[PDB]
UniProtKB/Swiss-Prot annotation, chain B:
Protein species of origin: Escherichia coli (strain K12)
GO cellular component, one term: cytoplasm
Similarity annotation: Belongs to the TrpR family.
Function: This protein is an aporepressor. When complexed with L-tryptophan it binds the operator region of the trp operon (5'-ACTAGT-'3') and prevents the initiation of transcription. The complex also regulates trp repressor biosynthesis by binding to its regulatory region.
Main subcellular localisation: cytoplasm
Disulfide pairings: none
DNA-binding region (UniProt annotation): 67-90
Quaternary data: Homodimer.
Protein name: Trp operon repressor
GO terms of biological process kind: negative regulation of DNA-templated transcription; regulation of DNA-templated transcription
Location of the protein in the cell: Cytoplasm
HAMAP family, per database record: Trp_repressor
InterPro entries per record: Trp_repress, Trp_repress_bac, Trp_repressor/repl_initiator, TrpR-like_sf
Coiled coil: none
Amino acid sequence: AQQSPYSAAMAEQRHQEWLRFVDLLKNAYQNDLHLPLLNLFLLPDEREALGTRVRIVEELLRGEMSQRELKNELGAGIAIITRGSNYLKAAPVELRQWLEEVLL
Amino acid sequence: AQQSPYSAAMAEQRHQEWLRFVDLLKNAYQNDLHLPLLNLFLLPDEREALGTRVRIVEELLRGEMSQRELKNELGAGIAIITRGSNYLKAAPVELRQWLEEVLLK
Ligand SMILES: O=C(O)Cc1c[nH]c2ccccc12
Ligand SMILES: O=C(O)Cc1c[nH]c2ccccc12
């Protein structure tokens, strides 16, 4: 299923729309408007999920909590641990090194 | 006491966890790591939804796209237009005014 000019054109547009959000948020942090901006663009349950994903990443990096603890404390089952681990492994090395410094 | 202690305790925890995310992202922006951090913490489908929500807010603020165009171009039917409009109305006026300056020019 190789990509066509139609599919490539749509994918480029979606990427530019994502970058426009990223840039809006960047400027909101510089204006101290990021809290209401994130409340406008993210639903309550989405904000809750992001806060939980940070805890999962933190605990996976620390390597102390067992899988049972991850489930009971964070609601994180084996599937989400596996995905979370894959995303950590796929991260650029500069990000992983920075997350170990900030979260730990 | 707006809530009972079980609900208050949960809310307090979620609130601290959300602010932890917000500060991590703040510092990622300052370190130029925001793009990989957002790839790590947001699924591709979520990133697409946020990019689309920005277009929806832009078009609701601009006032020129019709209801049928919002549906056909952005997948925004009546219910999502209504919710989007309600969120805009609930926003502090300062943010709405800033969005018009930043998105519309
Ligand atoms: O995979 C998911 O279900 C959501 C998700 C996105 N980024 C994450 C990082 C850690 C744990 C879960 C996620
Ligand atoms: O209501 C939704 O389905 C998600 C959503 C969150 N913030 C929004 C702004 C504009 C349009 C939709 C949304």
